[PDB]
Design a protein around this ligand. Structure first.
Ligand SMILES: [Mg+2]
Ligand SMILES: [Mg+2]
Ligand SMILES: [Mg+2]
Ligand SMILES: [Mg+2]
Ligand SMILES: [Mg+2]
Ligand SMILES: [Mg+2]
Ligand SMILES: [Mg+2]
Ligand SMILES: [Mg+2]
Ligand SMILES: [Mg+2]
Ligand SMILES: [Mg+2]
Ligand SMILES: [Mg+2]
Ligand SMILES: [Mg+2]
Ligand SMILES: [Mg+2]
Ligand SMILES: [Mg+2]
Ligand SMILES: [Mg+2]
Ligand SMILES: [Mg+2]
Ligand SMILES: [Mg+2]
Ligand SMILES: [Mg+2]
Ligand SMILES: [Mg+2]
Ligand SMILES: [Mg+2]
Ligand SMILES: [Mg+2]
Ligand SMILES: [Mg+2]
Ligand SMILES: [Mg+2]
Ligand SMILES: [Mg+2]
Ligand SMILES: [Mg+2]
Ligand SMILES: [Mg+2]
Ligand SMILES: [Mg+2]
Ligand SMILES: [Mg+2]
Ligand SMILES: [Mg+2]
Ligand SMILES: [Mg+2]
Ligand SMILES: [Mg+2]
Ligand SMILES: [Mg+2]
Ligand SMILES: [Mg+2]
Ligand SMILES: [Mg+2]
Ligand SMILES: [Mg+2]
Ligand SMILES: [Mg+2]
Ligand SMILES: [Mg+2]
Ligand SMILES: [Mg+2]
Ligand SMILES: [Mg+2]
Ligand SMILES: [Mg+2]
Ligand SMILES: [Mg+2]
Ligand SMILES: [Mg+2]
Ligand SMILES: [Mg+2]
Ligand SMILES: [Mg+2]
Ligand SMILES: [Mg+2]
Ligand SMILES: [Mg+2]
Ligand SMILES: [Mg+2]
Ligand SMILES: [Mg+2]
Ligand SMILES: [Mg+2]
Ligand SMILES: [Mg+2]
Ligand SMILES: [Mg+2]
Ligand SMILES: [Mg+2]
Ligand SMILES: [Mg+2]
Ligand SMILES: [Mg+2]
Ligand SMILES: [Mg+2]
Ligand SMILES: [Mg+2]
Ligand SMILES: [Mg+2]
Ligand SMILES: [Mg+2]
Ligand SMILES: [Mg+2]
Ligand SMILES: [Mg+2]
Ligand SMILES: [Mg+2]
Ligand SMILES: [Mg+2]
Ligand SMILES: [Mg+2]
Ligand SMILES: [Mg+2]
Ligand SMILES: [Mg+2]
Ligand SMILES: [Mg+2]
Ligand SMILES: [Mg+2]
Ligand SMILES: [Mg+2]
Ligand SMILES: [Mg+2]
Ligand SMILES: [Mg+2]
Ligand SMILES: [Mg+2]
Ligand SMILES: [Mg+2]
Ligand SMILES: [Mg+2]
Ligand SMILES: [Mg+2]
Ligand SMILES: [Mg+2]
Ligand SMILES: [Mg+2]
Ligand SMILES: [Mg+2]
Ligand SMILES: [Mg+2]
Ligand SMILES: [Mg+2]
Ligand SMILES: [Mg+2]
Ligand SMILES: [Mg+2]
Ligand SMILES: [Mg+2]
Ligand SMILES: [Mg+2]
Ligand SMILES: [Mg+2]
Ligand SMILES: [Mg+2]
Ligand SMILES: [Mg+2]
Ligand SMILES: [Mg+2]
Ligand SMILES: [Mg+2]
Ligand SMILES: [Mg+2]
Ligand SMILES: [Mg+2]
Ligand SMILES: [Mg+2]
Ligand SMILES: [Mg+2]
Ligand SMILES: [Mg+2]
Ligand SMILES: [Mg+2]
Ligand SMILES: [Mg+2]
Ligand SMILES: [Mg+2]
Ligand SMILES: [Mg+2]
Ligand SMILES: [Mg+2]
Ligand SMILES: [Mg+2]
Ligand SMILES: [Mg+2]
Ligand SMILES: [Mg+2]
Ligand SMILES: [Mg+2]
Ligand SMILES: [Mg+2]
Ligand SMILES: [Mg+2]
Ligand SMILES: [Mg+2]
Ligand SMILES: [Mg+2]
Ligand SMILES: [Mg+2]
Ligand SMILES: [Mg+2]
Ligand SMILES: [Mg+2]
Ligand SMILES: [Mg+2]
Ligand SMILES: [Mg+2]
Ligand SMILES: [Mg+2]
Ligand SMILES: [Mg+2]
Ligand SMILES: [Mg+2]
Ligand SMILES: [Mg+2]
Ligand SMILES: [Mg+2]
Ligand SMILES: [Mg+2]
Ligand SMILES: [Mg+2]
Ligand SMILES: [Mg+2]
Ligand SMILES: [Mg+2]
Ligand SMILES: [Mg+2]
Ligand SMILES: [Mg+2]
Ligand SMILES: [Mg+2]
Ligand SMILES: [Mg+2]
Ligand SMILES: [Mg+2]
Ligand SMILES: [Mg+2]
Ligand SMILES: [Mg+2]
Ligand SMILES: [Mg+2]
Ligand SMILES: [Mg+2]
Ligand SMILES: [Mg+2]
Ligand SMILES: [Mg+2]
Ligand SMILES: [Mg+2]
Ligand SMILES: [Mg+2]
Ligand SMILES: [Mg+2]
Ligand SMILES: [Mg+2]
Ligand SMILES: [Mg+2]
Ligand SMILES: [Mg+2]
Ligand SMILES: [Mg+2]
Ligand SMILES: [Mg+2]
Ligand SMILES: [Mg+2]
Ligand SMILES: [Mg+2]
Ligand SMILES: [Mg+2]
Ligand SMILES: [Mg+2]
Ligand SMILES: [Mg+2]
Ligand SMILES: [Mg+2]
Ligand SMILES: [Mg+2]
Ligand SMILES: [Mg+2]
Ligand SMILES: [Mg+2]
Ligand SMILES: [Mg+2]
Ligand SMILES: [Mg+2]
Ligand SMILES: [Mg+2]
Ligand SMILES: [Mg+2]
Ligand SMILES: [Mg+2]
Ligand SMILES: [Mg+2]
Ligand SMILES: [Mg+2]
Ligand SMILES: [Mg+2]
Ligand SMILES: [Mg+2]
Ligand SMILES: [Mg+2]
Ligand SMILES: [Mg+2]
Ligand SMILES: [Mg+2]
Ligand SMILES: [Zn+2]
Lengths: 49, 96, 79
RNA sequence: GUUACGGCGGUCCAUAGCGGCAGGGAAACGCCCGGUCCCAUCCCGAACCCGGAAGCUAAGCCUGCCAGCGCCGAUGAUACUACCCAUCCGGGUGGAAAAGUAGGACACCGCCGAACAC
RNA sequence: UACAACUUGGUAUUGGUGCUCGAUCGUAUUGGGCCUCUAACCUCGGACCGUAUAUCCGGUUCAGGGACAGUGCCUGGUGGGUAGUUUAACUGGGGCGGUUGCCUCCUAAAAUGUAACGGAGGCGCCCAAAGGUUCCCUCAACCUGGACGGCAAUCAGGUGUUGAGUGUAAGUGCACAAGGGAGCUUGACUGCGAGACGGACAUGUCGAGCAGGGACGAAAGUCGGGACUAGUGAUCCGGCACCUCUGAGUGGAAGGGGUGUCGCUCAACGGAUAAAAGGUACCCCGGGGAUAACAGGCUGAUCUUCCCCAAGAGUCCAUAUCGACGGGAUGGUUUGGCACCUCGAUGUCGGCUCGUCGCAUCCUGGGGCUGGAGCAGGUCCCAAGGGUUGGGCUGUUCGCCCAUUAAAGC
RNA sequence: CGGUGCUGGAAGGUUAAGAGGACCCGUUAACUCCCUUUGGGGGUGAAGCGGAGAAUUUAAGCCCCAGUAAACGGCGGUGGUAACUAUAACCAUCCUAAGGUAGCGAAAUUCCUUGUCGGGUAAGUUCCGACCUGCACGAAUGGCGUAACGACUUCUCAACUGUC
RNA sequence: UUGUGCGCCGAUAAUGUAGCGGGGCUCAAGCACACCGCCGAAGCCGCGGCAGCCAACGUGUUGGCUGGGUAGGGGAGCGUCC
RNA sequence: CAAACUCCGUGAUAGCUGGUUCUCCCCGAAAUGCAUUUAGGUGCAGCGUCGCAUGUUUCUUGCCGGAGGUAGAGCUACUGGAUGGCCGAUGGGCCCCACAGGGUUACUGACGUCAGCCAAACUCCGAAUGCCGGUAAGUCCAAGAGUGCGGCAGUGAGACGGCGGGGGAUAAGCUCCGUGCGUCGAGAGGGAAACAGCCCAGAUCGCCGGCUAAGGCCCCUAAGCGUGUGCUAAGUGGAAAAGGAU
RNA sequence: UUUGAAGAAUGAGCCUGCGAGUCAGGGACAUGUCGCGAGGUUAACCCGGGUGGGGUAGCCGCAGCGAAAGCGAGUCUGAAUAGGGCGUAUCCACACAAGAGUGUGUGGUGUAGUGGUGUGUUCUGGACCCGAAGCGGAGUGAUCUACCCAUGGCCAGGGUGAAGC
RNA sequence: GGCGUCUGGGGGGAACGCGGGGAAGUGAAACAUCUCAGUACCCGUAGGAAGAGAAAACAAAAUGUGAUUCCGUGAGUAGUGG
């Protein structure tokens, strides 16, 4: 849809903490980022969903 | 004026109201001490005669005030504040 | 015959907002300039949108240095 | 104290820039000599970095002189305008430009550090 | 958006046999399709009876049909036949056009702000990097060409100060870079937030510092999205994940609850509903000169009538008579603009009768000049006393036509 | 015969109610580590209970194939193309289903428009008769004529008269 | 020729002069320049009265001011019936 | 009669129209913005009132610190736009194309330079104003000044005139803006004959008093048919231009 | 009513009577004012041919924060002294900081609401007064007219001359 | 079916009560859900009252209430609602 809608989840957490938009046409590979989510209290890569 | 009225363009306050409530009242430790110049124990009937709660009302209170006179307590659910107030006063505040 | 014009924008109400020699308090805004009509000085913050403010009580002071315009705050003497 | 020295600095940052002319190598400055080792070329020791001081101040820098050009700028007037006016019609007081003109003008100054002298 | 009516199936009024078709070619799956039959059911066929008379009706017999049909209930179709309704505002009268939010500039009168159907342009995104940070560095203009190769492709020598540029328009900025390249990497963090800016209000903007962790740089420090300003949507209802919220009496659970997060060109963009088009000259009501159609009024673009300079026309000669390109005025009469008077009423075109006034004069009257031989003209000046056709055509005003007069005026 | 209807054909696709029971979910006996002594605190899940819950059977209809116009309805534009002269009477274009045949036609339809021409009058924007450039006729929401009829429409003529 | 202040023509409407308000005005009662005057309002001042606000003092006087007003707000009253 | 008549729901509902009754005393609006199935309605903020509170925090001026970016001005300063000149190689090019002489040929001529304008979206310049901030004096027997909070409704149909302007044609008594503009609205008085909006000026009441503003002083009509110095012959005064005239 | 009217804009022929912000509610609030005061007050109801007495059933404030669990002069937020949001009525004097305006700790001044009565506003009621076109339910009408149904009556006189014979 | 005989009822009445049926104007600033409201109105019953009435009700561990009906509360609260 020109710009799909993507959620990001922690690994131990598994909490839909971060949400962001992308161009799926030019990025068919899933998005990887290192970030922070509060409750487990430390940085940790977030996955796509 | 037709425009979205304020009372209708704000979101409902979340959470329920928990109709089931065993609620009570606090009669200040300071007020109790002020009422006890001589002190002694404290009972539901005595505080009713003192007129600090509904006569049937069951009471949970706090230790906002200080107790210097020996005042034993006949109570149901205390607060730790008034519990230590009574203990420092050197009496008893037993919970029934 | 019909017109194709007639639309416009809002009115952001920009422009300097605390004038020279005034008394301003911490976190106070000084200007709202689209471009860099001015330039930060000691105790002045460069906002996220080219806005100017003060990071310490005092009196604002304009002044030209090197042919530009830069704002600065002189801390007024403590009574 | 002097200096025809180098860094950092100032200033409602061109009265301080540009152009032409002449001059500087004791020290410092530049250029400079070569790339094992640091490091770099989207290739190149061009840039940077590094080792050394054989050479030279041409370039750049500096200083001095030149009004060719930038540049600052009067007094005066004019434009303009706050207020008030008279039956429009423009004046009375207040404020006073821009451009142009005589002119000015080839920066000044601070702190440290280098060569001569005490 | 429904509903009346019409139409389907299942289910009930509901019975039996024979056949033929299925999932645990010789072992099993209970229902579908057909042919029959009487007995439910129908009969508006017949014949008796109530009856002395009764075409209603009830009962009896037989006869035809017959598990059909009809009827309910659920359901699907179709359904202006019937019904309740919707069908925007802005508008220089309405309607048709165009717009409806957001962004840039001008109008904007040097704080802000400030309208118009005023002048001009864009937005409903893009981006794992075009983000952060560290580091390097800066153009374009420029003369020459071992050949293609040219006016321009890449160039280096050596005046080189944005004149080049900076994701998407304009303005504001930007070389101390906001401009490129690379390296690394995620701060496009988490919870707060001193105080402010703007907001009628909901909202919207900026922001130093505090706690954990991380990023770049040895460090200094910078890092809470993109150089900024557009890229947007309230509330309800619902969906999904986590929690040390509750839990209709015991546990509980369920049931509900929070934080995070999705569903609208709801663009008529603060969104009357999940759900919407038209005529009414068959009309109707309450209102308005808040707003049109005629008139009056203000105005004079256009109109008409004057006038100014004078090239050329006119055998040569500007002005006998026309006057090119232009300019300045008058009247309020034509086409127009405004909506100030009248929508608790100002009757509209022509014709008929009747007229009355002005004069920019149609004749009659008096003059000047002629490109005035005379007659007959042309033109301009004074003059409003008087007069100023009739018919055919069309509702016509007008106009053409016929035929008169001194004329057939505006 | 495309659209909308109606009429026939239901082989296919979609879909009703009604039946239904795979998954998922709740609860609870037993338990499952250790604690006491005469089951709960650190998860499974018993049969039933119920919750949402399946797929599977489904008629008409719609989609689909034909017919139907005295059913509602339509019947074009474009270019080229002759022995003087303007034409198309022939061919090519697109597209839809076709692109107006006979008849009539500035008419009750013709806006320019008082079309042009002729008759009637001195004069005829009305009339009659023709031409066809039918803006925007047309064949059962019928075309063309039609004897007679009409307190119907238009026009002319003789008598007629104070309508003038 | 030039700069000037006044003048003139340029100049035609409709019910009746009707483009100084009129009469009239140049032997200006017009225009320009100065002066002195005088008229001219509900402006101001003069005298008397009422009321509001305010300050001082007192147990309501003194002094300063203000008093137009629609929508509308506030304060205090008159009268009628019972 | 485009859904008969009587009764009833029925006081149907009316953002619409009309009307709204005794006196005095005090203060005194707006026709704005925003939003609106909204434009002739309504609500919020400004605008008024009453009370309470802070009691000058408000106002005027002088001085001081300030930023502008308008009028104007300017342009070899840029974006644009413009006229006339200069060498003009090289029209960055032509009569013979030689690979070499001339528009030996009137062209084009770029750049730049000499000068002269113009611009709301041009500014290498740049005010009087207006605004915000600080200080000080003054009205300080109070304006009845400000700000906050609280009860109360109006109003969101403006007009005109002067200023700066857009549109219109520099027309409208036109429309749309700005004026810590003015006035009417919501204002009586005098002047311009008449005339809200133009000029002068704020009506507590009464007085058969006086001084004055605008405008006037021959009569209607109160005031000099005044003083002195000049102009005009046109009733100009007491409607008008381009142009013309011993 | 209007920006604006002598208005040629509306309404009034005249007089006299009648005619328009009322009324109810433990309704809500604010202002006056009245009683009591950390308290204030009662409804319905019972009994006095009389407004008395009884009746504390109930409601408001005394404490708020949090959506809720819950906490409590704090509380919510949050991993958090780490300040912020909301209250602790409100202030005076002492010390600690920056003097980021004020915050943080002590000793006193100690909290004022409630029920009448009258008033403006809001509230639901028809809610300041009159007024509509119209929608719906129940009934009354075909003595005019429309149609039709059954039974009667009406059509002077004078011409034209089909079929048939 | 047909007779004949005893006993009942038949209609009227203002409201109230029960029961069968049952709408729109209006508000929602429109409007369908919704509201108006089970109101008006129609109809059949009885009575002086009717109707309801002896829990298959609530409650919540108290070893509680104890038929129906009507008041004032509880409370415009829990909730329901484009
Ligand atoms: Mg998040
Ligand atoms: Mg803008
Ligand atoms: Mg040396
Ligand atoms: Mg090298
Ligand atoms: Mg050299
Ligand atoms: Mg050099
Ligand atoms: Mg210069
Ligand atoms: Mg210089
Ligand atoms: Mg000077
Ligand atoms: Mg003045
Ligand atoms: Mg004048
Ligand atoms: Mg100067
Ligand atoms: Mg069935
Ligand atoms: Mg069956
Ligand atoms: Mg339908
Ligand atoms: Mg209909
Ligand atoms: Mg309705
Ligand atoms: Mg409209
Ligand atoms: Mg208009
Ligand atoms: Mg229109
Ligand atoms: Mg501005
Ligand atoms: Mg406005
Ligand atoms: Mg666009
Ligand atoms: Mg990067
Ligand atoms: Mg080079
Ligand atoms: Mg960058
Ligand atoms: Mg770059
Ligand atoms: Mg804060
Ligand atoms: Mg840290
Ligand atoms: Mg930070
Ligand atoms: Mg950001
Ligand atoms: Mg950024
Ligand atoms: Mg909703
Ligand atoms: Mg239980
Ligand atoms: Mg349980
Ligand atoms: Mg749950
Ligand atoms: Mg909108
Ligand atoms: Mg809306
Ligand atoms: Mg809705
Ligand atoms: Mg009307
Ligand atoms: Mg009208
Ligand atoms: Mg009117
Ligand atoms: Mg009017
Ligand atoms: Mg007329
Ligand atoms: Mg008119
Ligand atoms: Mg009139
Ligand atoms: Mg005009
Ligand atoms: Mg001639
Ligand atoms: Mg001539
Ligand atoms: Mg009007
Ligand atoms: Mg009028
Ligand atoms: Mg009228
Ligand atoms: Mg009438
Ligand atoms: Mg008439
Ligand atoms: Mg007429
Ligand atoms: Mg004449
Ligand atoms: Mg003659
Ligand atoms: Mg002549
Ligand atoms: Mg004449
Ligand atoms: Mg005569
Ligand atoms: Mg066919
Ligand atoms: Mg077909
Ligand atoms: Mg079709
Ligand atoms: Mg199954
Ligand atoms: Mg079909
Ligand atoms: Mg088909
Ligand atoms: Mg014809
Ligand atoms: Mg015909
Ligand atoms: Mg015709
Ligand atoms: Mg015709
Ligand atoms: Mg014809
Ligand atoms: Mg005729
Ligand atoms: Mg035709
Ligand atoms: Mg046609
Ligand atoms: Mg046919
Ligand atoms: Mg046909
Ligand atoms: Mg038809
Ligand atoms: Mg026919
Ligand atoms: Mg015929
Ligand atoms: Mg005749
Ligand atoms: Mg005769
Ligand atoms: Mg002269
Ligand atoms: Mg003359
Ligand atoms: Mg006169
Ligand atoms: Mg005098
Ligand atoms: Mg007087
Ligand atoms: Mg006075
Ligand atoms: Mg006094
Ligand atoms: Mg008064
Ligand atoms: Mg008014
Ligand atoms: Mg009033
Ligand atoms: Mg009396
Ligand atoms: Mg009737
Ligand atoms: Mg009634
Ligand atoms: Mg009703
Ligand atoms: Mg009524
Ligand atoms: Mg109403
Ligand atoms: Mg009215
Ligand atoms: Mg006043
Ligand atoms: Mg003071
Ligand atoms: Mg200044
Ligand atoms: Mg300045
Ligand atoms: Mg200018
Ligand atoms: Mg110049
Ligand atoms: Mg330039
Ligand atoms: Mg010049
Ligand atoms: Mg400018
Ligand atoms: Mg600028
Ligand atoms: Mg300004
Ligand atoms: Mg100041
Ligand atoms: Mg005062
Ligand atoms: Mg108040
Ligand atoms: Mg009010
Ligand atoms: Mg409005
Ligand atoms: Mg308005
Ligand atoms: Mg308006
Ligand atoms: Mg206005
Ligand atoms: Mg106007
Ligand atoms: Mg004005
Ligand atoms: Mg103007
Ligand atoms: Mg107007
Ligand atoms: Mg006034
Ligand atoms: Mg007046
Ligand atoms: Mg007068
Ligand atoms: Mg007065
Ligand atoms: Mg007189
Ligand atoms: Mg006199
Ligand atoms: Mg005199
Ligand atoms: Mg004299
Ligand atoms: Mg003289
Ligand atoms: Mg005159
Ligand atoms: Mg003249
Ligand atoms: Mg002349
Ligand atoms: Mg008015
Ligand atoms: Mg009036
Ligand atoms: Mg009259
Ligand atoms: Mg009137
Ligand atoms: Mg009238
Ligand atoms: Mg009216
Ligand atoms: Mg009348
Ligand atoms: Mg009468
Ligand atoms: Mg109340
Ligand atoms: Mg009270
Ligand atoms: Mg009290
Ligand atoms: Mg009692
Ligand atoms: Mg709470
Ligand atoms: Mg939190
Ligand atoms: Mg804290
Ligand atoms: Mg009372
Ligand atoms: Mg009805
Ligand atoms: Mg009947
Ligand atoms: Mg025969
Ligand atoms: Mg009976
Ligand atoms: Mg409603
Ligand atoms: Mg509504
Ligand atoms: Mg309803
Ligand atoms: Mg109900
Ligand atoms: Mg009885
Ligand atoms: Mg009973
Ligand atoms: Mg209750
Ligand atoms: Zn995590």
């Amino acid at each position: 849809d020109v710009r799909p809608k993507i959620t990001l989840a922690c690994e131990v957490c598994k909490h839909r903490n971060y949400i962001t938009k992308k161009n799926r046409r030019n990025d068919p590979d899933r998005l990887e980022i290192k970030k922070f989510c509060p409750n487990c209290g430390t940085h940790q890569p977030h996955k796509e969903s | 004026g037709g425009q979205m009225p304020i009372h209708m363009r704000l979101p409902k306050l979340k959470g329920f109201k928990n109709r089931f409530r065993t609620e009570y009242q606090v009669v200040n430790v300071g007020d109790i001490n002020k009422a006890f110049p001589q002190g002694g124990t404290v009972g539901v009937d005595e505080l009713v005669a003192k007129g600090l709660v509904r006569k049937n009302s069951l009471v949970k209170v706090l230790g906002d005030g200080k107790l210097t006179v020996k005042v034993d307590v006949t109570a149901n659910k205390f607060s730790g504040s008034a519990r230590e107030a009574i203990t420092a006063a050197g009496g008893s505040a037993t919970e029934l | 015959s019909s017109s194709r014009n007639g639309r416009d924008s809002a009115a952001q109400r920009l422009g300097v907002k605390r004038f020279g020699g005034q008394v301003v308090k911490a976190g106070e805004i000084l200007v709202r300039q689209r471009g860099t009509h001015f330039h930060p000085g000691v105790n002045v913050g460069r906002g996220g949108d080219d806005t100017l403010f003060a990071l310490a009580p005092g009196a604002v002071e304009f002044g030209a240095k090197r042919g530009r315009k830069t704002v600065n705050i002189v801390p007024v003497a403590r009574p």
